């Protein structure tokens, strides 16, 4: 449950920085690796977090 | 075996330190890391 | 110690 | 488990942008409000994320 509010907070930030084409490819990775199981939601959270930090050190042009 | 993936990723024209960070943040996924790097 | 930063 | 890995990533990033004693004092305040329960970990994760996001939106000079 708490995982869902966290996931919603990551996504709001993520869509400001990542193109829709990349988020679609992320969803495709999560589906093939995890299906629609809850482990997939936790992976998405972890991936978006690390990628956002990697994105900011590179330089956010937004 | 996975050093091959990061070397292909570097051959896209990206610094090694960034490539390693993105490749592991994208779990095992070379293509997802590539699409991430090319989206920057 | 998860809440600690030292 | 996964929650602790998530928090360790946040703590590593956060310490690059905010003074360590001040983050540490935030942690003590959360400890006073939640004890050793997982709700304390879950609150600080949300707080550290939101602090990082507003920091990057303001402008990270680091
Ligand atoms: Zn950005
Ligand atoms: Zn900063």
Author numbering:
A (entry chain A), D (entry chain B): 17 to 78
B (entry chain F): 166 to 205
C (entry chain I): 74 to 79
Quote the paper.
HIV-1 Vpr is a prototypic member of a large family of structurally related lentiviral virulence factors that antagonize various aspects of innate antiviral immunity. It subverts host cell DNA repair and protein degradation machineries by binding and inhibiting specific post-replication repair enzymes, linking them via the DCAF1 substrate adaptor to the Cullin 4 RING E3 ligase (CRL4DCAF1). HIV-1 Vpr also binds to the multi-domain protein hHR23A, which interacts with the nucleotide excision repair protein XPC and shuttles ubiquitinated proteins to the proteasome. The structure as well as biochemical results reveal that hHR23A and DCAF1 use overlapping binding surfaces on Vpr, even though the two proteins exhibit entirely different three-dimensional structures.
Here, we report the high-resolution NMR structure of Vpr, complexed with the C-terminal half of hHR23A, containing the XPCB and UBA2 domains, and a 2.2 Å resolution X-ray structure of the Vpr/UBA2 domain complex. Crystallization of Vpr1–79–L-hHR23A223–363 yielded crystals belonging to the P3121 space group. Surprisingly, no electron density could be located for the XPCB domain, most likely resulting from its loss due to proteolytic cleavage during crystallization. Mass spectrometry of the crystals confirmed the presence of the UBA2 domain but provided no evidence for the presence of the XPCB domain. Crystals contained four Vpr and two hHR23A-UBA2 molecules in the asymmetric unit, and the structure was solved using the phases from the native Vpr Zn2+ anomalous signal, collected at the Zn2+ edge (9.65 keV) to 3.0 Å resolution and further extended to 2.2 Å from a dataset collected at the Se edge (12.65 keV). Further interactions in the complex involve Vpr’s α2 and UBA2’s α3 helices. In the X-ray structure of the Vpr/UBA2 domain complex, the features of the interaction interface are very similar to those observed in the NMR structure: the backbone r.m.s.d. between the NMR and X-ray structures for residues 14–78 of Vpr and residues 315–359 of UBA2 is 1.07 Å. The Zn2+ atom is coordinated by residues His33, His71, Cys76 and His78 at the C-terminal end of Vpr’s helix α3. His78 is the penultimate amino acid in the current Vpr construct and the Zn-binding cluster is important for maintaining the global and local architecture of Vpr. Amino acids F34, W38, L42, I46, I63, L67 and I70 (helices α2 and α3) of Vpr pack against UBA2 residues F354, L350, A343, A340, Q339 and L336 (helices α3 and α2) in an antiparallel manner. In addition, residues at the C- and N-terminal ends of Vpr’s α2 and α3 helices, H45, Y50, R73 and H71 and UBA2′s α2 and α3 helices, Q339, E345, N347 and N359, engage in hydrogen bonding and ionic interactions that contribute to binding.
